[PDB]
Amino acid sequence: VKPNYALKFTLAGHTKAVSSVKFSPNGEWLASSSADKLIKIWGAYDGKFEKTISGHKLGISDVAWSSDSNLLVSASDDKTLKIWDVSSGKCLKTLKGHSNYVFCCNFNPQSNLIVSGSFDESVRIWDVKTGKCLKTLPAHSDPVSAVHFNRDGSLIVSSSYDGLCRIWDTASGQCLKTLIDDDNPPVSFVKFSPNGKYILAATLDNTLKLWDYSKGKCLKTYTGHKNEKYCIFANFSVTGGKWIVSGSEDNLVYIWNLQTKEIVQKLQGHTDVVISTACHPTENIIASAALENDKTIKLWKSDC
């Protein structure tokens, strides 16, 4: 089986490179963030522009939804994160504490905590309600490219240009694991699988890898795309066939069969590097977003 993603909508409006796209957990919305300092909300099913959320002083590198789809958190070159109430557009809290650009962010599953990674080479854990920093982890020795909570929130995974993936105990801040393979390329992205058994990691040598983090073993590698320069998001697609989805520096979306590692589809249309992709939580829908020469978001739908 192969999917049949087809272009349905193109979303224009950001005035600079798009940095991140994410579907709300309730499936209704797509949030996007951009070098243009803005967050935009769009209908997930019709691509219809909903609203703009503004307030950051500098470009935004990441945005993420709370579990109940009510809140967003964003990470900006202004060295802050902001927590937003989506329905009102209000900035509820500005999270101050990183000493350099904040590059990546996520809520835990209970959405009472936020994790962030920064060019300051740290990972910070923040209290959502009070907005105050609970823990700072001296996590890495180069900028932190990605941060993600596991399924119950007891662990954090981080990745860095230092070539390392690390797994942290949320409660204690202790480094429980360092993952690295036979080479030391910068690691540009990581996340836990939906079931929380695995970690998917991107490295800037054109490779994605699926790790059993419990065993410290690399189980699968995905190759064929181009990724040497940018921190490109990758995903597990689980609504239909089980795929791996990623952007690429050849302006395409790549889809692999998770088990076989064969490329099953490539999606053409963007005119610049596809920096970010996201997968709809219940429908076979992919959003993709491209860099400065393109500035658009595209929504693709498949029968499986």
Binding site: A35, S61, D62, D77, Y101, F103, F119, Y230
Partner: peptide
């Protein structure tokens, strides 16, 4: 920054 991601976009650079």
């Amino acid at each position: 920054a991601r976009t650079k």
